Design a protein around this ligand. Structure first.
Ligand SMILES: *[C@@H]1O[C@H](CO)[C@@H](O)[C@H](O)[C@H]1NC(C)=O
Length: 402
């Protein structure tokens, strides 16, 4: 959609690039909200109304084609990100699901490079990504996420999408969802927006999930019909990694009795380990809390290969059939080598209560505990803070005390 007159003011975030030989050196980055979180309205003289809901093509009256939709639909800039639950402070990013006045912005943002014109491009295969987090205010049902999607570097800026990455265009993920605009252009045929996705972190204070999701296409893929569905071009389920699903129940939770105590802040380290030819073989998650490295748990489940890392055998044995078929770990790693965009978000699920995240086999939350109406009784203003985003060489983004 066509940027309007209201200016976009992007919050600044300091992040880091780390080497063993150099340590962690500061870098300037900027934050952008998804294009579809911006106010989009019809142009002058076209009547009241917007240019489509999530899940659908843009309205046929004003968007019979791309050219028309580009001139009839206006994307206003957001001059004050704090109205969307998004604030930064030095190296911390704070995302408020719900504001003090009750609005529910549920923000989703991407990391921009230092120029503001292009997304930061992370190349993580053979490297590690780390961050500190405070998940104290995320009860059952909440999902605080920090992940990678193979979005195009400028947001697919083009003649009918002059806004680009500067207005948060170009979102895609492994669910191949239909949005009114795709790559900043009216999605006239109602295709889904697909792309490889590495879910570094999906969690709350009760449960933590990690999951690579492959697609058999590079970069953003516009799907139609069955290409968008369970048997299509992208792996909706992902190869899930949650201590609870592998029968290790005292690893992560609120309390002293968990190895990672979510009542206090902690560091999250994710290593994309490769062979000497550079193809991704293993994904390794571990934590650092109170000065001590908390190594990953080992799977403790009958029929599940004994392992402390994500790999092909684990994925395949746990029923990740689409994951393997659409490229497997090596495929996930080739997307991570091509370069991926960082996305951070916080949200709840009225339909399913995020049950897959922290209920039944995935955790301790009871049935109905994760409904939005129960979430607000446990925590009326759910939020998450991500701090010190840092990445580089294996072994250099974290430290242990002794
Ligand atoms: C789950 O873990 C407990 C404790 O180690 C064990 O006794 C039980 O057999 C495990 N369940 C399966 C299905 O492996």
């Amino acid at each position: 959609q066509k940027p309007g007159e209201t200016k976009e003011v992007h919050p600044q975030l300091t992040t880091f690039r780390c080497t063993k030989r150099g340590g962690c050196k500061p870098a300037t980055n900027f934050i952008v909200l998804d294009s579809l979180w911006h106010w989009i309205h019809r142009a002058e003289g076209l009547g009241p109304g917007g240019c489509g809901d999530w899940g659908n093509p843009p309205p046929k009256d004003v968007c019979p084609d791309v050219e028309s939709c580009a001139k009839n639909c206006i994307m206003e800039g957001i001059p004050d990100y704090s109205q969307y639950g998004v604030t930064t402070n030095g190296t911390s990013l704070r995302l408020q699901h719900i504001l003090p006045d009750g609005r529910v912005p549920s923000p989703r943002v991407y990391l921009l490079d230092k120029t503001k014109r292009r997304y930061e491009m992370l190349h993580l295969t053979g490297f590690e990504f780390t961050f500190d987090v405070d998940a104290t205010k995320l009860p059952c049902g909440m999902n605080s996420a920090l992940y990678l999607s193979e979005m195009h570097p400028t947001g697919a800026k083009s003649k009918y999408n002059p806004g680009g990455a500067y207005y948060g265009t170009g979102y895609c993920d492994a669910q191949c969802f239909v949005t009114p605009f795709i790559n900043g252009l009216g999605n006239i045929e109602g295709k889904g927006s697909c792309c490889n996705e590495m879910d570094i972190w999906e969690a709350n204070s009760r449960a933590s999930h990690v999951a690579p999701h492959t697609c058999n296409k590079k970069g953003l893929y516009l799907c139609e019909g069955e290409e968008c569905a369970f048997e299509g071009v992208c792996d909706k389920n992902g190869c899930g990694w949650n201590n609870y699903r592998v029968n290790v129940t005292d690893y992560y939770g609120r309390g002293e009795e968990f190895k990672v105590n979510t009542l206090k802040p902690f560091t999250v380290v994710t290593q994309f380990l490769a062979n000497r030819r550079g193809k991704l073989e293993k994904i390794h998650r571990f934590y650092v809390q109170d000065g001590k490295v908390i190594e990953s748990f080992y799977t403790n489940k009958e029929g599940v290969p004994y392992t402390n890392m994500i790999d092909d055998e684990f994925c395949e044995a746990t029923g990740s059939r689409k994951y393997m078929e659409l490229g497997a770990t090596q495929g996930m790693g080739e997307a991570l080598t091509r370069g991926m965009v960082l996305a951070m978000s916080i949200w709840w699920d009225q339909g399913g209560n995020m049950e897959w995240l922290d209920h039944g086999e995935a955790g301790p939350c009871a049935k109905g505990e994760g409904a939005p109406s129960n979430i607000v009784q446990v925590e009326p203003f759910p939020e998450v803070t991500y701090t010190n985003l840092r990445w580089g060489e294996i072994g250099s983004t974290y430290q242990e005390l002794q």
